[PDB]
Amino acid sequence: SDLIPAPPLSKVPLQQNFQDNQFHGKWYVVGAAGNVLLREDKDPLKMYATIYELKEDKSYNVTSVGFDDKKCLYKIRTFVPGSQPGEFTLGRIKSEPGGTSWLVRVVSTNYNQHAMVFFKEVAQNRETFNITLYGRTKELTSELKENFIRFSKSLGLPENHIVFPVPIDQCID
């Protein structure tokens, strides 16, 4: 009808012995694959950054920097530690209608260079999910590309459901 079924959590590995204070900091969104498709309006999706800030209570203050309409956009929220280290939930979700509970899981990371992070939504029977490719820089090697594509496909996503955003020199640096 619109989307690919969200794969079981078994299909989604977790970074063994996840290290809080080393995943902290800025990650560029250099790749994105999701079951929800796009508008393809204009055609290129701009690159954006996400700053993970570790707090005392082990939650992350998550600030995302984007650029659109001659404006720098800032999206601030909290990632609450989930059942296993490397897993997060989205809390404080109330008020504005749409009880969307998010599931966050760190699959793999260098801490120093790359990370791949799984995202799952639960809201009204049909579930939206995406995998995000993070890098400490904006560079994208064919090796990292191919790695990500194959990981996407193993979760049931087609080639055309995978996006590699064009790098920008505005807001995100």
């Binding site: 994105a32 796009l38 650029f67 929220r77 979700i93 998010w102 966050v104 995202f119 995000t132």
Partner: peptide, 11 residues
Amino acid sequence: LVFFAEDVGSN
């Protein structure tokens, strides 16, 4: 969308 990945849509 500008924040097309991660916890999409929120707020």
